[PDB]
Amino acid sequence: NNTATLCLGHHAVANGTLVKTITDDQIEVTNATELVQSISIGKICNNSYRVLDGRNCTLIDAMLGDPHCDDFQYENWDLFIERSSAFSNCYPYDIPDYASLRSIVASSGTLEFTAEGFTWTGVTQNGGSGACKRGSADSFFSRLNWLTKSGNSYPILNVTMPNNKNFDKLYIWGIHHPSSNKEQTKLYIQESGRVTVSTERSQQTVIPNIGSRPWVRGQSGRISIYWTIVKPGDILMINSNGNLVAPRGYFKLRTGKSSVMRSDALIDTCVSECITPNGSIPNDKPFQNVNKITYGKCPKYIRQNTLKLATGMRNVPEKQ
């Protein structure tokens, strides 16, 4: 001969994969990769972050010192897991703006408590209740000090505690709402209680309300919990003529990377830096469809369960 033929071409595959483009809903390309994480590992991995199982204890109940939560006293976490089978087992209580207190403690990452030596003249300390048993003994929240009358009296208490430290102090204190009139005077002498907790910058006053509330673990009365943050250089002041549930000290507030999540998932050894209530998920993909609730280094949550990114040319198989 004295000629040749030279043809230019490109590859193709037996079966390609469909993708979306600007102009096409489904068009076939040689290859693609998934951009949405839609399955989870099935359990929460505990090797990348410190994950603490709350077991039968809500974070709040662990903070307050519900006897069945005693194990949590020296504890810290990156992520606190609250189980749906958690329960209270102390004196029936409420916390106005519960959610904020839960948020603050969660964020702080620690239940390290520093006890302080308050002086409580003219009152009896360490009140206990049948409803809050620790062993076989009538007891109370370990972080709270139930003050009652001593001898004939219950004086107007006037106690202070300076913050000489370089961090914010978190104080948890409260008030007792008795179920009856004779119970009020039996415990506190005075007919009507009062608690005022103050700093230089702020003040809180609470009045108890005597009366019946629904039966909870034998109790017709209630305890209301409040909190106060004291700043470096400030001083905490407590005035009361009855009904005060005293603080025993403070928690150290950290601004941290810590949080709390509601999950009933198993916690086991494995590798992952993204935690959802369904379990940990891998983060090799920029998007995820598992849960809007996440903690850690996570793909972003979107409504789509699949998104294919083309990784090859348009697929044009050989025909026939």
């Binding site: 979306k20 483009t21 600007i22 102009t23 096409d24 809903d25």
Partner: peptide, 9 residues
Amino acid sequence: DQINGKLNR
């Protein structure tokens, strides 16, 4: 066709 694809999307 291309423009109709854009439109539908």
